[PDB]
Structure formats: C-alpha cells, structure tokens
C-alpha cells in the first residue's frame, strides 16, 4: 500500500495507473489513523466489516487531480473528470482517498506535467479507457494530424502553481477498487497467541477445530503444512 500512496510522482488522471494488489494482507487500520487525507470517502464498504472481509482481487488506482475536481470521484456523480478521464460505476463498492500535495506537485514556474481529458467524443462505457491523443474533429473539416480551428489536442495541462488557491492545488487521489469474483486478499485477522494444555477453538491457516494444543517433539518435512492420523482426523498443524 505504501508504494501507491507514498509514490514520488503519480500518473495523470486520464492515464491513471492501475496496480493489481493481491496475495497479501491488508492493513486499512493505518489509513483511518493516517489523518493526512483531505478526502476519505467509502461508499460500498463500511469500516466495521472492511478490515475483516475477503475479496478475490483489489486494484490500486492512483492519480493527481485538483481540489475542486476531487468531489467528482463518486458513484453517480459525473462531470469533466468522471465522464472522460475515469468513471466510477454507480455501484461503486469501495473507497475514495485524496490528500493535498501542493508541496510536491507544484513548481514555481508552473507544473504542467499533470494533464486531463477535457473534450472526448462520447461518454465511456464501463471498463473503457481513452488514452488516444487523437486530434479532435470538432466540425466537418478532417484533421490531417495538424492543429488549428476544429482541430484540438484532447489533452490539456493543469495550471499547477503554488500561488493558486485551495481548489487548484494538486490533490493526490488513490482509489482501491473492491470487487469479488480463491481469496488471496485478506486483512490482519489478528494472529492471537496460542495456549497450551487446553482444548479450545483455533484458526490455523483457515482450519478450525477443538482439541488440546500442547508441545510436540516431532520433526516433519518442511513443505508439508499439516498432518492427519489413521482416522483422517487432524493431529498437528504448523504455526507461521
């Protein structure tokens, strides 16, 4: 998670960067305790079940937009950012995180490296991504690869300057897509210390049962995870 949030420079909103996060354990308790995000909105997921729920895959979408344009990142809400650059599904089960970064993404002479899609031919279908810099034909005259009237470049640069106001400051936005289709994405789950000489209920790598958990002086092969007896009942398990 740190590499996405604490990255040096993000990709622009039109070409937002999609990172597949899988085969790891989530620690969302840090994000709530972070208290460094200007926007912290979770629509389809509530914090009570968020930290202890399993999903097939989670993707890290991150980009940089302006303060006034943070609010368009919402299911149902549309506009110049939510229609041509990145549209959330109206059934957005996930979270929206944004924070101010006028310190990094603002140059004195003008940070013109973060761009958007201002004017796109149509609206976008779900899971559609317009990275085409195709010159717009805003009339009848075909654009022969050259700029001019009715021939405009579909990408315009943000006027990121430190002197700009709150709404024009660069607000770094990270969206973690929650979806479920195999559960390689989980949360902390709290690894509770074990007990000895007591039959209790345990969760060993997704295995549950009742029986006394005592010391054992057997050496089993490292690759094998757990064993069974003649009657196929589990008799031992390896703690990570």
């Amino acid at each position, epitope marked *: 998670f740190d590499e996405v949030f604490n990255a040096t420079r993000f990709a622009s909103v039109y070409a937002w960067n999609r990172k597949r996060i899988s085969n790891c354990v989530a620690d969302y308790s840090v994000l709530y305790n972070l208290a460094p995000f200007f926007t912290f909105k979770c629509y389809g997921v509530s914090p009570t079940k968020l930290n202890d729920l399993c999903f097939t895959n989670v993707y890290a979408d991150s980009f940089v937009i302006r303060g006034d344009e943070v609010r368009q990142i919402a299911p149902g809400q549309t506009g110049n950012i939510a229609d041509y650059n990145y549209k959330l599904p109206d059934d957005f089960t996930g979270c929206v995180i944004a924070w101010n970064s006028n310190k990094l993404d603002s140059k004195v002479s003008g940070n013109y490296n973060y761009l958007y899609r201002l004017f796109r031919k149509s609206n976008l279908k779900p899971f559609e991504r317009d990275i085409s810099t195709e010159i717009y034909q805003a009339g009848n005259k075909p654009c022969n690869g050259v700029a001019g009237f009715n021939c405009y470049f579909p990408l315009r640069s943000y006027s990121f300057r430190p002197t700009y*106001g709150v709404g024009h400051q660069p607000y770094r936005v990270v969206v973690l897509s929650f979806e479920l289709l195999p559960a390689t994405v989980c949360g902390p789950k709290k690894s509770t210390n074990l007990v000895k000489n007591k039959c209790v209920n345990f969760n060993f790598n997704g295995l549950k049962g009742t029986g006394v958990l005592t010391e054992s002086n057997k050496k089993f092969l490292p690759f094998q995870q757990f064993g069974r007896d003649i009657a196929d009942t589990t008799d031992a398990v390896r703690d990570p």
Partner: antibody
Amino acid sequence: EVQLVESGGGLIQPGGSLRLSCAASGVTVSSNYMSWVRQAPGKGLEWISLIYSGGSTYYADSVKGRFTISRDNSKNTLYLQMNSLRAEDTAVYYCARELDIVGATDIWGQGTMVTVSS
Amino acid sequence: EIVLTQSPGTLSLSPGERATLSCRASQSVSSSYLAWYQQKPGQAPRLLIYGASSRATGIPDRFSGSGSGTDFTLTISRLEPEDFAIYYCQQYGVSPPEFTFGPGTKVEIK
C-alpha cells in the same frame, strides 16, 4: 455565424406543459456543454439546468423533478420539456453555450417569453 | 452554496470615467471560476470575461477582470454610452453545478 434561436414559449396556465426548442447554427450542441438560464421579471438570472456533452443532466432544486432536458442529434435543436408550472415560473428563458474549461457562457440566444398565469 | 455578492448595486458615472464593480463570493472560489456578463434592457446577457482575467472574443480591452479566492473585481478604464446597463457576475461550483449569479449592478449615466 454562431447563434441560438429560442422558441416554444407562450402563455400557459398553472399546471400546464410546454417544450422549449432553441436551434443552434455553427455549433454542434452534442459535443458541448449546454444550459438553460431564465430571468424572472425584474430579477436576476436563475440557472435552470445543464446537459453535458457526456449526456449527464443536472438541475436546480427549484425546477428539479418537474422538467426534462433532451437533445435531437438529427436537427441540432435543444429541448426543455416544461411541465407542472407554477406562477413564478414566468420568465424569459435563454439557452446558452457553455465554453467548457469550467464556468463560462458566451453564446446566448435572443430569449423567449414564458408566462404562467390563469 | 457559494453566494455571489455584487457591490455597488448602483453606480452612476459619466461617460469616459472609470467604472469599478466588485463581486464577492461567500466562499473561496477555486482560482477564478467566474464569468462576466453584459445585459442590457430587453437583451440577453453578453459574456465579457472568463476566468476573471481573460477577455472573450469581441470584448473591448477597456474591460479587465481581477480577483482570486472570494473577491473578484471588474475595472472599466473608460465608460462608453453603449456600456451602461445591468451587470451580473457568475461562478461555477463543481459538486453541485452551481451557476450562482450576483445580485446585479445598475450603472447609469451621470
């Protein structure tokens, strides 16, 4: 030349229905952001609705739910389905072009009269 | 809601004099999302300035906008007889599409 020509106004009883129709010449409305702005007699401009080139339509709460905006690609003419009329809806209704790049309106139409009286 | 407040409501000045209008927003506007208009009696509003600094096409250079945050101001270097009419300022919010207009200013021949 680029100009808009509003039509479809007139006298309407309260609770009646109308459909304003302003055509565009020299500009393709389907590719642009487009809004309706009215002017109550002796009052300031009140924004009615905006339709995105992406198709999303938003309204002010004073007119939300009663009206419906639409667009015909075959004729380059705007629509604003007028319904459930009350007395203070009487205003001169302008449809005018939104420049994009957020917050500017340059090309206005001449204006058409809408009167809501018994 | 970001309410636009214009000042003054009436500004009586002679031709050739400098007119100054102030349109103050109830909240800090995001780097001048302001549109400026000319409206004459019986005529539709005519845009002059977008971004509170950039003049539109066909707008005399005597008009010049200025402002940031909450305060935004027009300066008319020379008042001409065709310029005397009712004037409205306009802003845009994003989460609602707030096209809030100012109360207005009537500039009269003095």
